[PDB]
Amino acid sequence: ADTKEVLEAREAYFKSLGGSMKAMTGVAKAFDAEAAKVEAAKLEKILATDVAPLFPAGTSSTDLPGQTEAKAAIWANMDDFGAKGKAMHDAGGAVIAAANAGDGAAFGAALQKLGGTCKACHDDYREED
Ligand code: HEM
Ligand SMILES: [Zn+2]
Ligand SMILES: [Zn+2]
Ligand SMILES: [Zn+2]
Ligand SMILES: [Zn+2]
Ligand SMILES: [Zn+2]
Ligand SMILES: [Zn+2]
């Protein structure tokens, strides 16, 4: 769809994930089941977003330099890109489950995994400007 709005939506989605990731890191080093649960609820809403519509062809950093960090490589590795997003969803579920179960150790560990899923995709698909 309209590059402007799709770029806006795409940026909103990832910024919210980044905020969520920051909040959860703070929670992990001084775990509290109540705080963990409010963060997991927020994450749960974010992951309910379908990102497919957010990456239409013609919106990479090559097409719109400076306007986005989405690498052209994404559109030639859609299956891989999709599998990496799926890994994030699965890791997110482990974090949420640990928050709901009030298990701090499981939360801390699930958090490491979630963080790894962000890096796995960023390493190949995000501009390291
Ligand atoms: C893991 C939960 C995760 C985090 C955290 C995260 C954050 C993040 C931010 C903050 C941005 C910057 C947004 C901005 O413009 O200000 C960003 C950008 C991209 N990401 Fe990411 N991201 C997380 C996970 C993943 C996963 C699993 C994927 C790929 C399957 C992914 C991809 C990207 C891409 C591409 C961008 C650039 C987007 C753009 O500039 O339009 N991220 N991410
Ligand atoms: Zn941005
Ligand atoms: Zn408490
Ligand atoms: Zn208490
Ligand atoms: Zn997703
Ligand atoms: Zn999911
Ligand atoms: Zn990263």
Side-chain angles (χ1 to χ4, degrees):
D2 178 39
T3 180
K4 312 175 171 301
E5 298 297 329
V6 307
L7 252 42
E8 286 175 24
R10 186 152 90 201
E11 175 172 61
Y13 174 75
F14 290 115
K15 276 181 183 175
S16 77
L17 281 174
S20 170
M21 194 67 201
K22 205 265 77 47
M24 293 190 287
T25 296
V27 176
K29 50 180 72 176
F31 188 78
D32 172 78
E34 281 69 45
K37 262 181 275 297
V38 60
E39 290 309 331
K42 294 175 185 183
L43 184 57
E44 197 172 32
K45 298 207 174 177
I46 304 178
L47 298 179
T49 306
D50 180 36
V51 297
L54 299 178
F55 290 87
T59 57
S60 72
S61 52
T62 303
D63 302 306
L64 308 143
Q67 290 184 262
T68 174
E69 298 183 301
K71 284 192 161 184
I74 295 177
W75 292 266
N77 282 262
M78 273 298 197
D79 284 14
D80 186 61
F81 187 75
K84 266 150 185 180
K86 168 66 185 303
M88 187 195 62
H89 283 246
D90 293 350
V95 172
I96 293 178
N100 292 346
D103 189 346
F107 183 80
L111 200 54
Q112 296 296 328
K113 282 235 172 181
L114 179 59
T117 67
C118 315
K119 181 175 149 66
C121 183
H122 291 169
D123 284 341
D124 291 313
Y125 308 119
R126 190 188 164 187
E127 289 285 24
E128 48 281 281
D129 292 339

